[PDB]
């Protein structure tokens, strides 16, 4: 087509979606990761994660307001990944990289799994 | 912080939100623009438009599944702006620029109003 494109649009949209999350506006699901609870927007979770895409396209699960993750999932790892979904920034540290990579494999977030594998390889 | 950032994340999120819209997945509102109907995600509309942000933060309107726009709004202008919200690309043409600018002023989409004003000024 002959469209023009606003370079910062996608980043500005994501910033506004994170402001809605901050302010608990139109959040429609609670993700439970053992004793912790995380409120989020189903559409953002589906857009970032192959696991959430499969969950919320299921004719029965699409209607659930609470999703319980596998008990082996680390809440801090999930929190770091949820923040990445809404900001593009990943708080990857020596002390959390194994939990973050395991969580990203479970959530099916291929680009995160890729950077974790590279950072681990560099330390070996 | 010491975060790393994935450059294409925001664009990839928006692409996936547009794929959900295409496929009518988790759309939660119908915007009516006279005889036409447009299905969308409230969160994407709020993230892009000052008018939708005000509508869906209202304690009564946040619960509506149908929103009727002012009868003066042009459906094609709205369609072009809805596509811009989900893609960052604006189909601005000599034949639609006046309707697009009027719609963007109503929806409170300042960057679109800005490029329309510039394109109009260049033709004068």
């Amino acid at each position: 087509d002959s469209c023009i494109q606003f370079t910062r649009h996608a980043s500005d949209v994501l910033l506004n979606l994170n402001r809605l999350r901050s302010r608990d506006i139109l959040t429609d699901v609670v993700i439970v990761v053992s004793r912790e609870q995380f409120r989020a927007h189903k559409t953002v979770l589906m857009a970032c994660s192959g696991l959430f895409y499969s969950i919320f396209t299921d004719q029965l699960k699409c209607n659930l307001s609470v999703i319980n993750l596998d008990p082996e999932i680390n809440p801090e790892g999930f929190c770091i990944l949820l923040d990445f979904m809404y900001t593009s920034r990943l708080n990857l540290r020596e002390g959390n990289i194994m939990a973050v990579m395991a969580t990203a494999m479970y959530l099916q977030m291929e680009h995160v799994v890729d950077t974790c594998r590279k950072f681990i390889k560099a330390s070996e | 912080d010491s975060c790393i950032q994935f450059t294409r994340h925001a664009s990839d999120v928006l692409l996936n939100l547009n794929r959900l819209r295409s496929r009518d997945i988790l759309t939660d509102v119908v915007i009516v623009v006279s005889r036409e109907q447009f299905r969308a995600h409230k969160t994407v509309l709020m993230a892009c438009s000052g008018l939708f942000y005000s509508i869906f933060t209202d304690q009564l309107k946040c619960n509506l599944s149908v929103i009727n726009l002012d009868p003066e709004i042009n459906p094609e202008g709205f369609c072009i702006l809805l596509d811009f919200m989900y893609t960052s690309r604006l189909n601005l043409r000599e034949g639609n620029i006046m309707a697009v600018m009027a719609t963007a002023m109503y929806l409170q989409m300042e960057h679109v109003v800005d490029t329309c004003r510039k394109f109009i000024k260049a033709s004068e």
Partner: peptide, 4 residues
């Protein structure tokens, strides 16, 4: 704004 750019030409994509």
């Amino acid at each position: 704004w750019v030409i994509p």
